């Protein structure tokens, strides 16, 4: 029977992979085909593959191939027979796109840190990779599965202080490892705990192995066989920060998972310096690493389904980098994801004064006061454009000759409906970044006032700058939020009337708002200002900058505002508004 050539280390995506098979599709996900024929682990792998969105039929359509031959354990693999089968696969094509899954790439006479089968061009997802046997953009490093993750369910113990500092629970280590661990234990004592040969036996003391790891803040993972140990998954599950002392070992999913925030890698020469290395790490970093290790276990190390999905996702990002998921989404726990901001306007650029701001003015059944404010607004320098949105559909716009004489190109937008959320629509006529939203009732603003507001906005392009000031307080008797404006010792919102903000915020309001706030506001004809403040605070994660030493900007309201605030807090799951006690006024 034919046998392929040995694994080629000079085999990358741009040479071995065939991108013609999976060119482009709307849902940018690769297609995986499975050969019809096995260990229960490999069965769970194939079931996970078949029950995902990467599984397809009509072999001519699929881009990746996963043969149904058990390769996970190489101790009883019968290399030659597996090679004959892979050659016989009838669609091998020199293994151009075939994906192989393995977790123990070790041979009893010698450990090659890679699959010993020919696998000329086959792509490997192996549990143990050295930096010499791992192809960078071609291969995937995967965890080695431990049955304990399904056999025992450890309690979700939170981060905190623990009895032991450095723990080493492994079986059959090389004598030098044992000698140096014993030296560390005898040097320090009562903190370093080494366990001898699912039960751990210390001198005249017994522990349960999966649960003893819960009592240590650092756990040692050594290189004894295959360069990849199943103890790593147990260490991550128990929450203790792993300490990997393998010399040349590439951790699982290192392409996308940032292990610098979840583990400590110490070269095995400096083993006597391990304790001094770990003592330098402060408590907060230890807690963060415990959290990250637990998240890594619960997301990728938990079951074979997680491993298969992560491997296919990594390959998919390799095939379609433009649609790849973010490394932040990859390593952040759900709690961090909820807490994280990820500001989209993160680039710190200060726009030049040569540009301007397109003032958008909203009126309905008010013409004699719209004119009085458009006249004053038009005086402001660096006002590139002025848009007036006409809400009242029954009434007609005034005559063009009746409009004032201004220095800027005016335009009038004919609304299809009468909704107060139409002022936040991203207009293609807006050629600037800053957008000045001003209301007809707002009159006590000078040209210097607006110019200073715009100048302040230029220093904070990514947040909300507004003249009026409102905030929210918490009452114990109603156990809810209230809308407070009578007094001001702090601020958390500025009304959209007389406010400067980026047009990206208009885009967010129109499209990326959750599906409840926009329709609720279009129903209630109120609380657009509060919704915009909530959205800005949630997306940018920053406070709001008031710009006036002034409060009076005009010549069942409050209950409705409180209801709006409570509803907006409920739909976001929290209260994104941040209270600040500072205002910006000119020097």
């Amino acid at each position: 029977s034919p046998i392929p050539e040995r694994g080629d280390l000079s085999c990358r995506m741009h040479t071995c992979f065939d991108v013609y098979r999976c060119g482009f599709n709307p849902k940018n996900k690769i297609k995986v085909y499975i050969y019809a024929l096995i260990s229960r682990e490999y069965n769970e792998l194939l079931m996970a593959i078949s029950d995902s969105d990467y599984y397809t039929d009509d072999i001519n359509r699929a881009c990746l191939f996963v043969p149904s031959i058990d390769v996970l354990n190489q101790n009883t693999l019968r290399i030659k027979e597996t090679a004959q089968a892979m050659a016989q696969l009838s669609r091998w094509d020199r293994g151009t796109n075939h994906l192989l899954f393995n977790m123990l790439p070790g041979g009893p006479p010698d450990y090659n840190t890679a699959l010993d089968v020919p696998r000329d061009r086959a792509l490997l997802a192996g549990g143990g990779f050295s930096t010499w046997t791992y192809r960078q953009g071609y291969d995937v490093s995967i965890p080695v599965y431990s049955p304990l993750s399904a056999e025992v369910d450890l309690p979700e113990k939170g981060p905190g202080p623990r009895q032991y500092f450095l723990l080493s629970s492994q079986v059959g280590l090389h004598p030098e490892y044992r000698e140096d661990l014993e030296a560390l234990q005898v040097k320090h004592g009562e903190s370093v705990l080494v366990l001898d040969k699912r039960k751990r036996c210390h001198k005249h003391q017994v522990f349960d192995y999966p649960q003893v790891l819960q009592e240590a803040t650092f756990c040692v993972v050594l290189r004894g066989a295959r360069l990849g140990q199943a103890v790593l998954s147990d260490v991550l599950q128990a929450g203790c920060v792993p300490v990997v002392i393998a010399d040349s070992y590439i951790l699982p999913f290192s392409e996308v998972l940032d292990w610098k925030r979840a583990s400590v890698v110490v070269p095995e020469e400096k083993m006597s310096d391990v304790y001094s290395i770990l003592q330098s790490i402060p408590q907060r970093q230890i807690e963060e690493m415990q959290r990250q290790a637990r998240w890594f276990w619960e997301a990728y190390f938990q079951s074979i389904k997680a491993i298969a999905l992560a491997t296919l996702q990594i390959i998919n990002d390799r095939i379609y980098p433009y649609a790849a998921i973010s490394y932040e989404e990859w390593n952040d726990p759900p709690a961090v994801k909820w807490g994280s901001v990820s500001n989209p306007l993160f680039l710190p650029l200060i726009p030049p004064q040569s540009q301007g701001f397109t003032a958008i003015v909203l009126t309905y059944d008010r013409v004699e006061s719209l004119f009085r404010v458009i006249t004053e607004v038009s005086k402001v320098p660096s006002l590139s454009k002025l848009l007036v949105v006409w809400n009242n559909q029954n009434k007609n716009p005034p005559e063009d000759s009746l409009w004032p004489k201004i220095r800027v190109p005016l335009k009038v937008v004919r609304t299809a409906e009468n909704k107060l959320s139409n002022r936040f629509f991203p207009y293609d006529e807006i050629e600037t970044e800053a957008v000045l939203a001003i209301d007809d009732d707002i009159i006590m603003l000078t040209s210097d006032e607006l110019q200073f507001g715009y100048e302040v906005w230029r220093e904070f392009p990514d947040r909300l700058v507004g003249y009026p000031g409102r905030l929210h307080l918490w009452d114990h008797e109603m156990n809810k939020w209230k809308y407070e404006s009578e007094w001001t010792n702090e601020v958390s919102m500025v009304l959209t009337g007389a406010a400067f903000y980026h047009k990206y915020f208009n885009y967010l309001y129109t499209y990326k708002m959750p599906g409840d706030i926009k329709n609720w506001v279009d129903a209630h004809m109120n609380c657009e200002d509060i919704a915009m403040n909530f959205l800005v605070a949630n997306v940018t994660g920053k406070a709001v900058i008031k710009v006036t030493p002034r409060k009076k900007f005009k010549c069942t309201h409050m209950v409705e505002r409180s209801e709006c605030i409570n509803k907006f807090a409920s739909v976001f799951g929290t209260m994104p508004l941040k209270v600040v006690e500072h205002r910006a006024d000119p020097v």
Partner: protein, 603 residues
Amino acid sequence: PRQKRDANSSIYKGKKCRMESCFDFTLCKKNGFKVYVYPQQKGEKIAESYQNILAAIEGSRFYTSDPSQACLFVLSLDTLDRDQLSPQYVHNLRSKVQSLHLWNNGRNHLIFNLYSGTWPDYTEDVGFDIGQAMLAKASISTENFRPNFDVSIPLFSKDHPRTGGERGFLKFNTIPPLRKYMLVFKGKRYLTGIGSDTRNALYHVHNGEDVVLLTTCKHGKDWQKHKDSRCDRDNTEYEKYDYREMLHNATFCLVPRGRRLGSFRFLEALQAACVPVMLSNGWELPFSEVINWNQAAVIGDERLLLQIPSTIRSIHQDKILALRQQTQFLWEAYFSSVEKIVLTTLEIIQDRIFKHISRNSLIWNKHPGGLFVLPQYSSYLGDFPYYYANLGLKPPSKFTAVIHAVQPVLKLLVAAAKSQYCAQIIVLWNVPVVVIEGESKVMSSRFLPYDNIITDAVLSLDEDTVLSTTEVDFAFTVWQSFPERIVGYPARSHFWDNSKERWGYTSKWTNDYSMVLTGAAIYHKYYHYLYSHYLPASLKNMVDQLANCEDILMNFLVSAVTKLPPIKVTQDHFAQRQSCMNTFASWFGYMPLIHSQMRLDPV
């Protein structure tokens, strides 16, 4: 055991070198990372680009003149251009490098290379036997890249700035991010050779409205000799645009493979803010082992050339915005100057020595970058002011008062102690109060890192500045909103003199400000470390000699790190400041100081 490690070291000492085999960690063995530059022989030509590289290394903080102390070596010989047809090629280099006393088979040598290979079948022809040396080559193929040994560096011209910055072209962050064109390219095409297959097939995808790609075969003698049946039309269409107007008016810029995988168009694309769409197969992008290029560019296989425009159109709008901003951040962080490139290479090498003291995948790919974030201070992101939004952490609620003393000082200590946010007070002589003995009247020693400072925020305050407790609380509350800046009362500005072409300093009734003085200022403790372990000894020594200008350098450093102005809050000696500012601008290469007309006040 150790036998296995020795066997691995011996066996893999070749093309497959890594750090655990082809390196010696014993020479660094400390936080002090030092690089030694071989002295000039004064007998060979020196290219301007390699001269800039060596000046960046020499003027850096990793430079040492003692070969025993260093654990990284850089040759002074010209290695950037290894093409035999180039006018910068150095002959007899193979025998010349073996005559060096400190070569030691190039065990700990870093070699910079930008061009390799000759006219037929361009390859990695460095000429001399590199041995164990890791090369910071520009155009590296994927199958010829050592995953964690070599460094892929950008390819830059001889006119690339050495210390200064070009600031980028994205002045307006306009929405929609789309521009007049969708995908552009304007470069030569080669009739015969290697690397012209992708350039010859651009006329299929050329559209003329959104995807406009222009090529010419006029590249020498073949301008009329072997021209095919398309050179005439291609050249007539080519002479219609400018390659600069069409670069700043395009959302995406195509960067295909030429003769070599790397190209001059990459840095131009990053400067122009247009998202680069790379087509060269098997290219290790600059700092690919350190920078996530999926967040700053588009990577597409040139085998799937025809359907690229559909894929580029399918890219969502917010993704385009994120890519466009990431491009500018990368340009201003790691590619704006030769100094930034060289220091990026050295810092990437340094991160491989101590794996427990290094930068995570988030520091590099986020503001302000790895050059201003030194992991020796702390590998924990919460100890830096820049990473609170990315995490779920609020800024510290406690600060440390530091008073540099050379009476109001007694009243000042009492007033500051009454603050609810004050944990400890440190008094410098040249709530628990701490007094630290001083050995010299070095007034820049007030910025040193101290083990007694527990809080992240540090209030630096001179003895002659009387500050009320309520003012301290208000300033700290303001700083909690902007943890990355300097928040203080006394502010001074800067100006440009046309009469003398020298920067100027004002301190009276200015219309704006660009510096806030450290006499009544609040800032993160990390800037104490960055002031000491990042700024060169020359500037700080000049500060000590003149007995002023330490706070001006403080503001310079903070503005350079944050690219944002300080925030003022309220409610013969003079001639030295101008020279100080001019020297600081000369070292930095530009003026990080930014004017600001805002002033925060309590409500």
